Design an enzyme around this catalytic site. Structure first.
Site, PDB file in Angstrom:
ATOM      1  N   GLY A 114      17.409  21.481   1.976  1.00 59.42           N
ATOM      2  CA  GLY A 114      16.391  20.231   1.385  1.00 59.42           C
ATOM      3  C   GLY A 114      16.667  18.912   2.042  1.00 59.42           C
ATOM      4  O   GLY A 114      16.563  17.718   1.612  1.00 59.42           O
ATOM      5  N   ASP A 122      12.554  13.666  -5.251  1.00 56.45           N
ATOM      6  CA  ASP A 122      12.766  12.377  -4.513  1.00 56.45           C
ATOM      7  C   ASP A 122      12.638  11.480  -3.325  1.00 56.45           C
ATOM      8  O   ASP A 122      11.646  12.515  -2.901  1.00 56.45           O
ATOM      9  CB  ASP A 122      14.255  13.390  -4.269  1.00 56.45           C
ATOM     10  CG  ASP A 122      13.979  14.174  -3.591  1.00 56.45           C
ATOM     11  OD1 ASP A 122      12.805  14.854  -3.216  1.00 56.45           O
ATOM     12  OD2 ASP A 122      14.760  14.870  -2.249  1.00 56.45           O
ATOM     13  N   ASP A 123      13.317  10.416  -3.035  1.00 55.78           N
ATOM     14  CA  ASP A 123      12.907   9.625  -2.007  1.00 55.78           C
ATOM     15  C   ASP A 123      11.566   8.917  -1.621  1.00 55.78           C
ATOM     16  O   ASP A 123      10.590   9.725  -0.412  1.00 55.78           O
ATOM     17  CB  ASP A 123      13.223  10.531  -0.403  1.00 55.78           C
ATOM     18  CG  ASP A 123      14.039  10.541  -0.786  1.00 55.78           C
ATOM     19  OD1 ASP A 123      15.643  10.532  -1.483  1.00 55.78           O
ATOM     20  OD2 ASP A 123      15.042  11.140   0.566  1.00 55.78           O
ATOM     21  N   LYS A 126      12.372  19.143   4.140  1.00 57.88           N
ATOM     22  CA  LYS A 126      11.660  17.773   3.845  1.00 57.88           C
ATOM     23  C   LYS A 126      10.012  17.505   4.872  1.00 57.88           C
ATOM     24  O   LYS A 126       9.674  17.368   4.531  1.00 57.88           O
ATOM     25  CB  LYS A 126      12.853  16.888   4.138  1.00 57.88           C
ATOM     26  CG  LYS A 126      13.366  16.225   2.648  1.00 57.88           C
ATOM     27  CD  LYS A 126      12.807  15.394   1.582  1.00 57.88           C
ATOM     28  CE  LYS A 126      13.675  15.230   0.617  1.00 57.88           C
ATOM     29  NZ  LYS A 126      14.620  16.003   0.074  1.00 57.88           N
TER      30      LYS A 126
END
Lengths: 453, 443
Positions: free
Chosen positions: B9, B116-117, B40
């Site tokens: 990840g 996320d992010d 990612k």
């Protein structure tokens, strides 16, 4: 007959065979003509120079040598035995002969002996036979040269291969004196300029070395090498080398960045340099700056090609992915990762503005700072933008090679932009790991913070 | 039903299929059981989450998933549409479905949606149809969970995925409020600890977050992640999570170093730590875990992937092989995010009590220095030795993954010794390049 091209000469992960083949296609494309095989950590090149190639290895290597012939690139096989060869002992000399002979039988017609980055001190047995370290090297070098049938191209790399490495200086070196005197004239000698990574290689300094070594050298150029600093990468143009060296040199083989795809500017701009004064003897033929634009322009096309219909409404979230990489992005990137002794303009500028904002932060004359900060925050914005659009590019092979560099710089410019924004009002802390702790004692819905990612 | 293994990840160069297959081998050997695919920067997992796998791509994914079944690893496929998805648009929601369908047709039982992010701010048309970012994530996570027939294993990663990210607090967060409420109970939630990289995960923090999400979380553990600092590698042991966590948790998926071969210790010690207390509601020791892991790893060094000198003649440079002292020092140099190893700090502490006391060479407090110095010049020679022996090892695949970290630390200790040798009597000036020059001007 000028050898101009690339030496895969560096420490770390070697390039794979697919990349080397692509490297030949690029050298041909840009009218360069030479590849020197010398990956310091390709185990049979140096560490285990003694060991012959497996059957599988031999196929791969023959194909490669074949690929070189196909693209009109001289393929030069180097071997690096200086770590533990016993020069005097003729069974070792016989192994060296066997190793090279296997390769000649793979189709290779050109070779090199490399004695860089080894201890000067010999073993008992070798001293009883040889006056000096230089004597021993010149001995096998000449023996091997002769045994391989005196080929048109044979290269020798001295242990004293730059200015700073000569004891006690270039012109009065016992080592080089011996090489220049004792090394057969048919052999060429490699030289990396005044230092390992020479900022400039002045003609004065080639004139000097040519005298002690009694011939024009081939430059082994480390201008764009990045093996010696995990954080660095060099996309600036060939620079610091007059076109007036060309007639006073036998060649220039550049030892570029480890990351294969980061070397577009590096090799491109060396070709522009060479071609600019190909037939000079003895008005400015070579502009680094122009050559850089010229190469970045060419490079840019590669980002839209892979590895190797839904628009959102006016009220809907826009495609992150929409905008592609621009020349402006690559012009910036190159300035941020320029040359070993010099940042590109856009990069120096940023540092000079931050240096200034940090000095005059006290002011809290004040419409200057608010204004300069603004212009800086905007610049920081182009770095992130640049990273963002690289991240999205179709050429994922190019992205992967550069990723960690661009991630670093965008992430640091982000903390810096934060720090300016805060002047006008996690492990980003153990940064550098232990290497950096040692290094810093040597002489020289709120928007979040401690968003690591 | 405890998910323990590895999530891919991180940011940057994803692992390749060969490496993923060898990961399943190792997970199964060490009796872990899950793999979460979430690279990612694998273009079609996120940036281009809408794009269907090509035929070549599909066969490779089929072969990989098959490899997971054969190693008895649960393959969870994640997708990450945060950056561009109009959640309100059902053409968009269909695109996601058509894509998770393709992947189930490759044999994939298990899925995840990761948020996320990303920026916590929805577009116009999205803000009309949903009351809060969380609502919108939950709506589509819910719709997708169902469509796929309530997969046994389905994961959700919240935008607010650690303590510090939660506005205003963990237990008081509107975003987590909506999640633990409206997100269907079958769906599991990912959580990284108090911080993004968490030095400790206290029971109290898990009990706390458990309450607001109304389920036991799966830890996405970033302890050994190294994508956020170019010079860092973490060879240290799983640490700062108590065995007492386990029964309070649905799982731990470690997200380790980018460099595949560096994650031996980072996964092996996790394995040890799970074994320690597989069921319950001291037992696990970092240092002893590490020694078992390092002692297993060394076996991999000597195997891939002659002449003998007279004492008159030059000794083989290659002779001495890598030792478990070498790996022990290496790991101490490249330990954990918030702490250097024993032998690492020792060397740093000495170099700082060699620099302070240096103008004491300018009679009882000289004999101290010159000795403490040469005991440190020797410790420096241990680093440069471990390098040359590594650089000679037979397993080049491991070397290459470590190489530049190993070259770096030896380079710096070589120079730091030079300094100590000098305090008792070329490009290192633009060290770190531009990023470096900026880092030195920060506080």
């Amino acid at each position: 007959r000028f050898l101009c091209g690339v030496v895969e000469g560096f420490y770390g992960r070697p390039w794979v065979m697919e990349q080397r083949k692509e490297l030949f296609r690029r050298l041909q494309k840009w009218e360069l003509n030479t590849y020197l095989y010398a990956p310091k950590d390709d185990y049979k090149h140096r560490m285990f120079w003694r060991e012959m190639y497996s059957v599988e290895e031999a196929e791969q290597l023959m194909t490669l040598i074949s690929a070189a012939r196909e693209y009109e690139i001289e393929f030069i096989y180097a071997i690096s035995p200086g770590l533990d060869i016993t020069f005097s002992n003729p069974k070792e000399v016989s192994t060296l002969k066997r190793k090279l002979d296997q390769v000649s039988q793979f189709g290779c017609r050109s070779f090199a002996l490399l004695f860089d980055d080894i201890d000067h001190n010999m073993c008992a047995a070798d001293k009883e036979v040889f006056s000096s370290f230089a004597h021993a090297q010149v001995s096998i070098t000449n023996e091997i040269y002769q045994y391989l049938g005196e080929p048109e191209t044979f290269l020798f790399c001295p242990t004293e291969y730059c200015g700073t490495f000569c004891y006690p200086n270039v012109s009065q070196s016992p080592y080089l004196r011996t090489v220049g005197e004792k090394l057969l004239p048919g052999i060429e000698v490699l030289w990396t300029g005044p230092k390992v990574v020479s900022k400039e290689i002045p003609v004065e300094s080639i004139e000097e070395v040519s005298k002690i070594i009694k011939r024009a050298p081939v430059i082994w150029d480390n201008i764009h090498a990045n093996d010696y600093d995990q954080k660095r990468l060099f996309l600036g143009p060939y620079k610091g080398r007059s076109t007036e060296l060309i007639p006073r040199l036998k060649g220039v083989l550049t030892n570029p960045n480890c990351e294969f795809e980061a070397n577009y500017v590096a090799i491109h701009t060396l070709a522009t340099w060479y071609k600019s004064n190909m037939n000079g003897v003895r008005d400015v033929l070579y502009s680094p700056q122009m050559a850089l634009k010229l190469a970045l322009t060419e490079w840019l096309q590669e980002f839209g090609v892979p590895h190797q219909q839904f628009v959102p409404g006016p009220n809907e979230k826009p495609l992150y992915t929409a905008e592609p990489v621009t020349l402006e992005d690559l012009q910036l990137l190159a300035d941020l990762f320029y040359l070993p002794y010099e940042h590109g303009p856009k990069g120096a500028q940023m540092l000079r503005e931050f240096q200034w904002l940090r000095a005059n932060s006290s002011v809290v004359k004040i419409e200057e700072w608010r204004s300069r900060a603004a212009k800086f925050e905007e610049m920081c914005g182009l770095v992130m933008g640049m990273f963002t659009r690289l991240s999205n590019c179709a050429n994922r092979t190019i992205l992967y090679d550069m990723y960690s560099y661009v991630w670093d710089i965008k992430s640091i410019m982000s903390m810096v932009k934060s720090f300016v924004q805060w002047l006008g009002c996690e492990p980003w802390a153990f940064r550098g790991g232990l290497a950096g702790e040692f290094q810093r004692l040597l002489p020289i819905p709120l928007t979040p913070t401690s968003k690591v990612y």
